[PDB]
Amino acid sequence: MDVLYSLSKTLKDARDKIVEGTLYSNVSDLIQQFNQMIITMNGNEFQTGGIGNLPIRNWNFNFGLLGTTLLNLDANYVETARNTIDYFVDFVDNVCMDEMVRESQRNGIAPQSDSLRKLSAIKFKRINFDNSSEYIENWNLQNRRQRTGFTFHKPNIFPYSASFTLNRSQPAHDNLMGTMWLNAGSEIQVAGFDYSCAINAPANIQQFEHIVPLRRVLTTATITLLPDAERFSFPRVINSADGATTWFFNPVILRPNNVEVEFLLNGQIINTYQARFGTIVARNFDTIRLSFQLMRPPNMTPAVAVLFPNAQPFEHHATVGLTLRIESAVCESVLADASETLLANVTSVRQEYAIPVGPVFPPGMNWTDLITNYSPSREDNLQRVFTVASIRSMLIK
Amino acid sequence: MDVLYSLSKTLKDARDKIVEGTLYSNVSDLIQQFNQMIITMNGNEFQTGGIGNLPIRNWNFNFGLLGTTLLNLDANYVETARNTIDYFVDFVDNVCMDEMVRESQRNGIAPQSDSLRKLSAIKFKRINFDNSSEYIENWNLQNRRQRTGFTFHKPNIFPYSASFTLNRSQPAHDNLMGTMWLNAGSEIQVAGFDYSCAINAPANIQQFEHIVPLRRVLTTATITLLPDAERFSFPRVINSADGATTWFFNPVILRPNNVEVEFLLNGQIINTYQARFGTIVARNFDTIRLSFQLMRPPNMTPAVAVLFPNAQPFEHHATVGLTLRIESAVCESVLADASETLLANVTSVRQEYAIPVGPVFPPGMNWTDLITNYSPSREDNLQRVFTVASIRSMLIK
Amino acid sequence: MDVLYSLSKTLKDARDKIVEGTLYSNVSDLIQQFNQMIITMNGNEFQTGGIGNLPIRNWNFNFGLLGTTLLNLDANYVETARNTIDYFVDFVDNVCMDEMVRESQRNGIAPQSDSLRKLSAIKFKRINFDNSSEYIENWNLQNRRQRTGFTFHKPNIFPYSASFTLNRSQPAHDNLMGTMWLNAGSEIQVAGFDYSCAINAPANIQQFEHIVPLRRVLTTATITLLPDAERFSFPRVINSADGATTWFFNPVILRPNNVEVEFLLNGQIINTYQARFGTIVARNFDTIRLSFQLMRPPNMTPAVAVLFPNAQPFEHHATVGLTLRIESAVCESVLADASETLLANVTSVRQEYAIPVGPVFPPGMNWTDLITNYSPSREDNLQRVFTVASIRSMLIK
Amino acid sequence: MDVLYSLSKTLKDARDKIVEGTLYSNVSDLIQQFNQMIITMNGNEFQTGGIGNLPIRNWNFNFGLLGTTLLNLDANYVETARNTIDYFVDFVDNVCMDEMVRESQRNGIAPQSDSLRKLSAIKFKRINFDNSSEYIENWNLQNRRQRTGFTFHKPNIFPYSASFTLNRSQPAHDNLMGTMWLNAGSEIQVAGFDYSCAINAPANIQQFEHIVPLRRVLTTATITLLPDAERFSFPRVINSADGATTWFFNPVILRPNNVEVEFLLNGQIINTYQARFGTIVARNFDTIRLSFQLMRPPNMTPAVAVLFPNAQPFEHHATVGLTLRIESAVCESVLADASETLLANVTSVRQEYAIPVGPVFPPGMNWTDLITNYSPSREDNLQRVFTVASIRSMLIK
Amino acid sequence: MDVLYSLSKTLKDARDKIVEGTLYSNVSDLIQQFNQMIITMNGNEFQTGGIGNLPIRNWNFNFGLLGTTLLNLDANYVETARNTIDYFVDFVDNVCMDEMVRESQRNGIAPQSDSLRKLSAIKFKRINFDNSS
């Protein structure tokens, strides 16, 4: 993997730096690296593809070195370099695709394609150059057995869920108390509703809880907490828990009372925020617990009081909600966020070449299933394929 | 353009790496590049500005070279370097502003400023340096007729459009069927409504479709799909199609049924997702077709059955919505996205210097119109101005 | 600060570039820099910590120079370098934490920790390497008093405030009129409501204004402007102004009329947009003025004429709105934003080591309070700690 | 860690091999190792302790080398060797305790004590000797990211949990169906009880299931499976689920039929045993699923017909049980077990010196809490402390 | 059988003794035994597996001897030895599995795999080491 990254990095640097008119002092080191790569790759034979519709390709390297004696590069030098660069880039592209399209239930972190297995050999260690990208450096740190971290903007850490729980319920669904929620991507919207507006509750306060556990620990997370669940603030016709019938939800929104948001690690409160909305920081957590109360307004103007009678007919249902968005975070394990395109690259390659479903990943690289059942083998394979995707994206666009 | 980028890149390297105390082995090659830049630019006169209120400024280049006989560079070296860096940075600033404030219907890729026309001369080619930035990389690629790729965080691809179609209507506007939609930036938000709740439709199912054609082909895009359109879920008073009257929209939200989101490329279905929400991948597409259905609930509790009568008066109007957000994507052409500031810089310069409206771009660089009619000439000019704006931002905030 | 950044940069390059098998020409300059660092740091003693629960640590430096007599690096060379790199990285981590957890009312920009004050000496200037990073570049520019600039994605510039103003009101809260806004992070949602729907207003138009003054001047900001306030478009029970009762708000949303968005600097209109929604550009401003109107529809269908009567029993309350998101902006001062993690890092260190509340920052680094009262001393201290956090993040993830 | 282990191993081999009268050919190599240890440690100052009640102690090494001119060891040689070895062993003991009493959320495996950090330097690598013991072997393997394995006799893999789940119940608790279980250490005892003895059940068969997920993946486990849970076969008075009241349980044991024990890995059935008791083997699993049925005896003698009526009064409650013990297993992670004293040693040191509760481990090294939340950081810290405990146990009796 | 145990013992000793920084006097005997094993195994081909789902694998031994260092062996030595150690460990793993998956009604004590039958030849007896387990 380090050799493959070095190949892609060398080719990208050759594309960027070997340009007409540039001083050779600008690319002396790069050309030494390029010649070393050519020497090491010469005389070796590689095969790629053969899975799905990915064609079987054979690669042979018999290239000549690059000049090192001009003062300023000219057009001839640029074309001579580009001819070799095209072939090397194609080889790297196909090796990366072959590695992406594959998976293994045991030792998913190790190379899976025969080309990458060959590059794992000691003879190719002369191609290492630089390891400065985020994914390659995290790879090297993990191998060295040190702390790793990927920084995500809107990490898709919540498996897609949209559901409700009814604590009080009847067949007619005329008088309900409970909660509804959507956990999607990097956002949690929760809304506790009570049809009676806590008329008969002790102290006219109804308590609501919502616990969202994560599949991986998030560190140094910036979060936005806002006091209304805009998704659960309009009339709705939902289908019963067992699907038999449908019930009505005509919410009227009240302020959430006694809002507590706790970020827990190993079941212990690491961070806790009370009645505080806006930007908050969770330093280290794997569970989010949101507690909030519907408190019946002790004082009501007539227009308000008419909404909440003390008898069964309830046309307006008192709802109080919270919205929590993870803007940024750091995680030890790879995830899918809104800024990176690695998941898109892997899924696109697999779909384009019609890879049969393997023994590890879910069909279509479904991120919801993957993050729902994020297992050790899945994490290893996902990190491997994402690292290869970053290596490939260095060259292909 | 490459020479302009190289001037900016060498100035940025000089302003970052020439700091008192640093070993000379850290800036040997950079100083070689800087001295070559000085030698080439010396004895030249450039004129910038004269368009709109942009001042007419003259640039004469006569600078001495930077020293080479020094182990650790000291305060004298830094001062003598910074005095030249300031002038070169200002010159690059003005050249970039002059380039940005100009457009051409014919040959929008060719340089427009006479300063950049001069820099296009073969004498200045010796300053080329390394074209490592994304925009300069793509500039070179499209010059060679190679594949280009720009990665965007929620690209601004949909021209702004807030509208509604009424498939069934009459003057009273009390029994309406159709769709509402808001396309903006990277979010489509559609909602099909039926006032009769599909009482008299075959199988008690009403079909809604929404076709959004992009002006450019997006690749490897991550898309968040959600089953409700929160924007069209509250009471509205909308002015009629011809502005003669206003009609009332009192929605009640049902789950969309038989959701199908398919991404098409030249009419062929490249991707398709059936009743799946969360994160999905569109590998290569230029049109989005969203099909959904309002299915009248087969079973209803009385509180719901009251809402949908058999006769005319329909107080509540059944609505089923979808929300689609392109979180990240790749495009061959240049676009405006959330993170980048190139559109903002170009518009800011034009507004600040009161540049008269030319033939290519719409007044005030209105992105809605620019992307609604994204002609080839507009694409050429937009790529040129965005590339020069990135070059400028490499030195100026 | 510059020396600490150079240490961190040298260590990051050492970890990235010093890998087994790499050509020595790929590292020679870095090795010269690393040996310079070892020579400078040898024989000095440092002490970090002692504030809060941050452990006291003593650092001693006696290391041998890395070799310079190999063609390709082998396991021996990497192993010899790694121990030195680990010790230096731990030292940089502890120095950064110790500097981050400190603050001062006077001269907050100056180094506060003993280690950083020691590093500020003249003997340590021999290690400067290159100040490429954005934060160190702006640090140097601000020290020279040149113009700095930080680019933010969704900058946090509006302190969280949800409020409402009632221009017309009575004890019964039956005939209210006024505005109702949330300003949070990078979004402004403002709704102007009138219970009478401008039945008695002059020309059947009710005017609404909302002024949001920013704490700092924002530059070349891309804004998204949309014609509804989704947050304020569903039934609400809202506490009265003095908190002695509750009133009812049952909105019906109309299109805002004569929308005018002004971005003002020093009271002078810099940018003005009339009836234009979507992506807009504000080149330079410090106040946002949103003006809109509720125009009673001149023509109404029966279903609307019913909603809007002449007498007091107003059951539906006319409402117009506007949403404004700052997608990306540039500021001379430092700010929290969605993409980055510097505020989270600083807050995390302080919370982890239980740093006592000092005289500058609000408890827990509450961003709302900080931005609300963003004094010059707070700006200085915040820039210092953010720069130190960036230096730390170069090595710790 | 490897250097600490090497010190301990050298000292142990010295205390056992260096005995009066032994040939010098038996201890020549060991004495060379001992002399190199002395040479490497000479002139170094170490400090241990300072946390809790662990005293701060200082260590200085200035020792002479053991002689090498003797063909046989005599009393004086052993005396001098013992005098040096006592001090070295005391230093090793204090280093090990200082390391064991410390934790870290980040980089749990990294050395935490000052002494071990100092020993991690490269000058001390000269004393490494042979890493033969199980724990140091696994330490090196996991350092290189290989497959580790610890062999446990009765692994303590199940957290203590004694509970019951009711599937049929009433307020009077006089007709109940459900399961009761105790999971403890390496033993699962589960008994399904039915008060009606499946009189009204379909086919007179009542199904019971029990799913025990393990926190770590065990491999090659020998498991004893017996057909009766002796723990739930006597009369009980048990608190109700809510705790308001107590209910009576009067079991009468029948044989469990259709016993199916399925060992699963990531939801995939790896091993399955039907109606099999005694020694079975589970090669690789992380979940255990026990299925067993209570079948009403088709033919009953009078003394059994009296027991099982068809009317409600159910004096004797049918019960079918299973016992499952993990005699031995292999795990990639580290666990407390019945044969090793590592957890006992760590807990004993912490309790003896009153180490304040840290941020990683639960108070008092509570194994229930550790295994219940066995996070990766806890695993790293636990492996480090167990390795140090084994190193200490090499010397301290 | 004794040859297989000796291979396992010498590989375990190599893994647990050939570590960066250790004296060469600590592993002189081990290195001599390891080089004897390499000499004896070199040029011999083995085939393992072929029963059930156990893959058929072919093993060829073409290795150089372990070197010497004056005082303390270093990282380069450890890596060079580790390559050969890994290959030998894989070979022994496969031989042991192929032996475990086989049985014989008559002469059940006798080796059942072709690999172990080859190792029972007289040429490999020079790899015996200490039978301590």
Add this chain to the structure above:
Amino acid sequence: ILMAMDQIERASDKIAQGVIIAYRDMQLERDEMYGYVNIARNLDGFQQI
């Protein structure tokens, strides 16, 4: 010199780069420079000392 020294040495005429023994009947290759030769163009498949 370091990049071209391999080629210079190979071009030399008074020395060879090595000798494969192979202890088996190998057909002499046919080359322009000489009718039949025992020219090995790479040491693939042989243990190297």
